[PDB]
Structure 1
Amino acid sequence: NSDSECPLSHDGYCLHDGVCMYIEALDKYACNCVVGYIGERCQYRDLKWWELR
């Protein structure tokens, strides 16, 4: 479904960008702020781009 529609809330649920995407009628939630904040719901490191990748 690519369900990431939670407008002002995607950036509200989280911190330094906030993005809500994983649900998919599975009630999932991956919250991916920015390459510099990712942990459970974006708050640890730049794992995504620099640290791990």
Structure 2
Amino acid sequence: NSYPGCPSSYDGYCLNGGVCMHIESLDSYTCNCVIGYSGDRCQTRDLRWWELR
């Protein structure tokens, strides 16, 4: 379950490689950034993740 994705109401909230998670349990929502994505939602795309290539 967990429904892979997130309420279309979003379709434009997760920033820079921001994976939108949706736990069916609490039906809540959250953007899981990554190894080079952070800040408010994940507006921090710094010299890290993507590295270069």
Q: TM-score, normalised by structure 2?
A: 0.45
Q: TM-score, normalised by structure 1?
A: 0.45
Structure showing greater radius of gyration is 2
